[PDB]
Design a protein around this ligand. Structure first.
Ligand code: CLA
Ligand code: CLA
Ligand code: CLA
Ligand code: CLA
Ligand code: CLA
Ligand code: CLA
Ligand code: CLA
Ligand SMILES: CC(=O)O[C@H]1CC(C)(C)C(=C=C/C(C)=C/C=C/C(C)=C/C=C/C=C(C)/C=C/C=C(C)/C=C/[C@@]23O[C@]2(C)C[C@@H](O)CC3(C)C)[C@](C)(O)C1
Ligand code: KC1
Ligand code: KC1
Ligand SMILES: CC1=C(C#C/C(C)=C/C=C/C(C)=C/C=C/C=C(C)/C=C/C=C(C)/C=C/[C@@]23O[C@]2(C)C[C@@H](O)CC3(C)C)C(C)(C)C[C@H](O)C1
Lengths: 194, 159, 162, 160
């Protein structure tokens, strides 16, 4: 019978039929059957957008210096420590306002896509560009956004954990005399001879 | 098939014959190849001529690497000076320009029509003049660019 | 898009690249609003460079506590550090208030340049005089945009104002 | 547009470049509202810029808490930084009360300077028109006079 195009050894997941990235119909675990697809798409788009902005910030932070006074550390992980308290409060306020006015308070999984025409991931920021174009082109643009979002999510995770293993900046990859990452500290069930 | 390039003072230049075997879409594909090679050769020749008259324009090239615009030399030397990221961005621009429109046979991209226009006709018969001028300039620039390549390779200097 | 404001005597419908030219009326509305707002902010910046040189810096303090006294502050890409941080915060706050008090978005009158600021008093029932003023606003905004970028570069390269 | 006030015996309908576009009677009404308002403001300004010279500065303090006096605040453009900031705020507040109490929108008595002052008036419509034209002429004269007085104060060291 029907099988998923991406995973040929698994059934074709439903609820992915009419969607931007649904032609590859990749959903092995099957959160499609359990959760509202509108919420899943909104979460995927938001994660991708957040991680794309996060990736360009992580890359460009040690470059574009910082606020007059704070020392943007080469390793972007310590920028949270180097950030001023006022800057953090302004960032939190801006994020709260932006993410709470976007849904008119229906900002929860039970109430967000309950009104009617809440398009998943359409916050109205330049949606007019898609208002023109021709269906297939608009869906192609949305697919470009989705693929870049997934790529940047994985990439930002990789950047963070590279800075963790190297204990340094992102760009000087594999420093001289690397010989592999240091073995992980702290105990485990196998550390006490499990 | 005597069109476009037939404007040449030589004429329908067919040494070693070629395109005599009714190769109409081979002719069109060679038109695409000639247009693309001409455009890239003209870009290259301009980017070789400009860095000597009004030389390397002041600035900076690589934040962490301390590479400036004045550090990178000209000619075939400059190949191994632009950092890996810089060459990556240049080749990515190449890839985006190539993949933006469909270049398959029959498409507007199968004749050099990518919507660049800019220096375009007013639809008053000067379209053929503009196309032929671009074709001739590219044809000349191809041999010019290969000659400059050989000069840099043998002499060693950018000239 | 060849009948809108903009297109004029020196050059016609100017489009060397491929922007617009494919319908997309909403995209053109976005680009026109962007052009108008950029021209307005530009014109303001152009004046903000020319005036402190043609007449002179303001007769006051700008910081009675810190005693900056206006005239101590230089003119152009160097006041960014001299003008107090709270002063820049207040300037950006006024700009943000100008942005958020109106509701620039599809269809509503704030997306075509009408930001409720009804100075430069132009009357109703007299179009083709309002339109001339709007076209002049567009042209002066374009000229001022190029001019203000040139002034940025002049200050940066020459190391000081003009 | 010859018969709508102004247009006094000296010269005629003075508009070297204005009102020649389309007439636009409502634009002329707005400009007349602005002219009457500017004339009243400039008449007050000229009177209050020449009176501290004809007559001594008011007997008092104008700021008992800050120990200022009407006599130790310099007359003219030097008074903007000398009159207490709260005093300027109150002056602007009275101006705002004048400008916001009665409506000044188009097609209203406020659009023609008709607020209800009524002190210098009459009942003979011809005399009403004569007094209105006199107010407009005095207002124009006061506009030019107060601008000249401001520039005399600025270019020179003080008033006059
Ligand atoms: C948290 C990020 C996130 C979220 C919420 C989604 C959400 C979605 N993706 Mg998606 N995706 C992501 C990241 C994400 N994606 C990344 C990084 C990639 C690149 C590999 C993809 C590649 C991808 C493909 C190729 C397809 C989807 C599809 C879908 C939709 C159905 C799949 C599903 O059941 O939900 C997914 C639910 C989750 C991801 C929740 C997290 C589950 C566990 C906890 C993750 C942790 C395990 C991991 C190994 C670490 C749904 C809208 C399908 C459909 O797209 O179009 C409608 C589809 O065909 N995604
Ligand atoms: C990070 C800071 C932050 C900021 C600036 C905002 C800002 C806003 N939120 Mg919000 N919110 C936040 C965090 C924030 N939120 C968090 C953490 C949650 C999860 C608990 C929510 C959950 C939430 C909901 C569910 C709703 C908002 C709404 C709103 C808007 C109306 C506020 C209003 O009129 O109050 C005026 C001032 C009030 C001072 C008093 C608030 C109570 C204080 C603490 C006492 C406004 C844009 C509403 C939005 O209506 O639609 C526009 C709405 O329904 N918020
Ligand atoms: C949100 C809660 C949370 C978080 C952040 C972590 C995070 C972590 N756990 Mg942990 N753990 C959790 C819940 C959590 N666990 C629960 C509920 C249990 C069972 C009671 C365990 C039992 C557990 C053991 C026995 C070990 C860890 C270990 C670890 C560390 C290595 C990752 C790993 O082996 O996966 C943990 C695996 C699971 C959580 C899957 C359980 C099914 C990592 C820091 C290991 C460690 O310290 O390595 C250095 C290790 O030996 N955890
Ligand atoms: C085939 C097209 C092509 C290619 C591959 C290059 C490649 C290069 N150019 Mg270049 N250039 C081109 C066209 C091209 N150019 C054109 C058309 C012009 C005319 C505007 C220039 C004008 C130019 C200047 C003025 C400079 C370069 C420089 C460089 C080198 C440093 C990278 C850089 O800053 O780029 C840009 C790099 C080898 C720099 C260099 O190394 O100096 C020789 C430099 O200073 N280029
Ligand atoms: C923010 C800039 C901006 C924007 C959005 C627009 C938008 C528009 N212009 Mg316009 N214009 C501008 C600046 C801008 N203008 C300036 C500065 C000039 C003076 C040179 C003009 C002169 C002009 C004419 C003469 C005409 C238009 C027209 C138009 C409309 C046609 C659509 C179009 O091509 O726009 C797309 C907008 C853009 C592509 C802006 C992109 C800017 C590029 C990508 C960045 C680089 C520009 C510059 C070289 C960089 C300088 C700084 C650099 C050194 C760092 C549209 C509403 C036409 C019209 O009225 O149609 C009805 C028309 O005939 N414009
Ligand atoms: C606030 C200023 C102001 C305004 C709005 C008006 C408005 C008007 N006047 Mg008027 N007027 C004024 C001041 C003003 N006047 C002054 C000061 C004088 C004395 C010279 C006059 C003398 C005058 C005469 C003799 C007549 C009018 C008339 C009119 C009406 C028709 C003409 C018109 O459309 O002009 C519209 C308004 C203007 C064009 C004013 C523009 C002011 C320019 C742009 C700035 C001038 C700057 C200044 C010279 C230098 C200042 C210093 C500088 C370096 C910063 C109209 C209601 C005619 C009338 O009654 O029609 C029925 C008429 O016959 N006026
Ligand atoms: C445009 C109208 C205008 C403005 C802005 C001012 C503004 C000012 N006047 Mg003034 N004044 C005006 C009209 C005006 N006057 C008129 C029409 C008269 C004639 C009665 C006066 C007579 C006058 C005197 C006698 C004095 C001032 C003074 C002052 C200054 C202190 C505030 C004060 O006591 O005002 C009082 C204003 C009124 C009573 C007008 C109502 C202040 C700069 C004082 C000052 O600084 O001395 C130089 C002062 O002693 N004014
Ligand atoms: C130390 C020292 O001083 O020595 C110097 C030496 C030197 C040379 C000066 C140097 C240099 C400079 C350079 C960079 C020289 C470059 C030379 C190039 C790029 C040669 C590419 C040829 C590609 C061709 C012919 C593609 C051809 C494609 C063809 C023919 C297609 C052919 C078709 O048959 C195909 C494929 C299908 C047919 O149906 C149709 C046709 C068209 C016939 C050095 C290396 O730096 C050092
Ligand atoms: C009516 C409300 C109001 C008050 C009451 C007020 C008062 C003060 N303003 Mg402000 N202001 C606006 C509104 C008000 N300002 C508006 C709408 C703008 C347009 C953007 C604006 C602009 C600036 C700038 C550019 C600067 C500035 C400052 C100060 C300052 C000095 C404090 C100190 O130095 O003692 C004081 C007391 C200067 C500064 O020093 O800020 C620390 C400074 O640079 N302001
Ligand atoms: C009946 C209502 C009323 C009261 C009760 C009242 C009282 C005070 N006025 Mg005020 N006042 C008006 C109304 C009233 N004023 C009106 C209609 C105007 C016309 C615009 C006006 C004008 C000014 C000016 C120009 C100044 C001024 C001031 C003070 C002052 C001083 C306080 C202190 O210094 O002890 C006190 C107690 C001076 C100032 O500095 O206020 C801080 C000053 O400069 N007033
Ligand atoms: C939408 C919208 C607008 C917009 C917009 C915006 C902001 C669009 C932004 C798009 C953006 C910002 C897209 C970023 C992608 C980043 C990616 C894909 C990261 C790749 C990173 C990868 C693939 C991996 C990197 C590695 O690091 C890893 C993992 C390990 C390292 O050891 C090695 C390296 C470094 C190689 C307008 C136009 C402004 C207005 C309009 O109205 C509304």
């Amino acid at each position: 019978k029907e099988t998923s195009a991406s995973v040929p050894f698994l059934p074709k997941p439903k609820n992915l039929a009419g969607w931007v990235g649904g032609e590859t119909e990749f959903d092995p675990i099957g959160f499609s059957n359990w959760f509202d697809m509108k919420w899943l798409r909104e979460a995927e788009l938001k994660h991708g957008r957040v991680c794309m902005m996060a990736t360009v910030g992580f890359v460009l932070q040690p470059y574009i210096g910082a606020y007059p006074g704070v020392e943007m550390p080469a390793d972007s992980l310590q920028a949270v420590y180097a950030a001023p308290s006022e800057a953090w409060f302004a960032f939190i306020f801006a994020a709260g306002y932006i993410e709470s006015s976007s849904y008119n308070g229906k900002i929860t999984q039970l109430n967000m896509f309950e009104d009617s025409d809440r398009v998943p991931g359409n916050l109205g920021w330049g949606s007019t560009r898609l208002e023109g174009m021709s269906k297939e082109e608009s869906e192609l643009m949305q697919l470009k956004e989705l693929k870049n979002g997934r790529l940047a999510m994985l990439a930002f995770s990789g950047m963070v954990h590279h800075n963790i293993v190297v204990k340094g900046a992102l760009f000087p990859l594999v420093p001289d005399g690397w010989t592999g990452p240091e073995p992980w500290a702290v105990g485990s069930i196998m550390n006490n001879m499990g | 098939e005597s069109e476009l390039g037939a404007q040449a003072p030589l004429g329908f230049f067919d040494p070693l014959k070629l395109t005599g075997d009714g190769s109409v879409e081979a002719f069109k594909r060679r038109r695409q190849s000639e247009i693309k090679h001409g455009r890239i050769s003209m870009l290259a020749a301009m980017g070789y001529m400009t860095p000597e008259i009004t030389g390397k324009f002041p600035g900076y090239l690589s934040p962490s690497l301390n590479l400036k615009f004045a550090d990178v030399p000209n000619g075939l030397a400059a190949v191994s000076k632009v950092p890996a990221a810089g060459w990556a961005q240049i080749l990515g621009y190449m890839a985006y320009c190539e993949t933006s429109q469909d270049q398959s046979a029959g498409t507007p991209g199968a004749a050099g029509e990518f919507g660049f226009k800019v220096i375009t006709s007013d639809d008053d018969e000067v379209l053929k003049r503009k196309l032929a001028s671009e074709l001739a300039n590219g044809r000349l620039a191809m041999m010019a660019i290969i000659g400059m390549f050989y000069q840099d390779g043998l002499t060693g200097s950018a000239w | 898009f060849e009948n809108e404001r903009g297109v004029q005597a020196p050059v016609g419908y100017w489009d060397p690249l491929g922007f617009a030219r494919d319908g997309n009326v909403a995209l053109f509305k976005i680009r026109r609003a962007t052009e108008i707002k950029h021209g307005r902010i530009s014109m303001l910046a152009a004046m903000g460079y020319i005036t402190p040189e043609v007449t002179g810096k303001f007769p006051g303090y700008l910081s009675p506590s810190m005693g900056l006294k206006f005239a101590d502050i230089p003119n152009g890409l160097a006041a960014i550090s001299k003008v107090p941080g709270y002063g820049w915060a207040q300037i950006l706050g006024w700009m943000a208030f100008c942005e958020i008090s109106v509701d620039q978005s599809p269809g509503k009158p704030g997306a075509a340049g009408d930001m409720g600021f009804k100075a430069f008093k132009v009357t109703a029932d007299a179009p083709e005089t309002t339109e001339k003023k709007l076209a002049s606003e567009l042209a002066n905004g374009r000229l001022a945009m190029m001019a203000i970028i040139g002034m940025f570069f002049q200050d940066g390269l020459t190391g000081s104002a003009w």
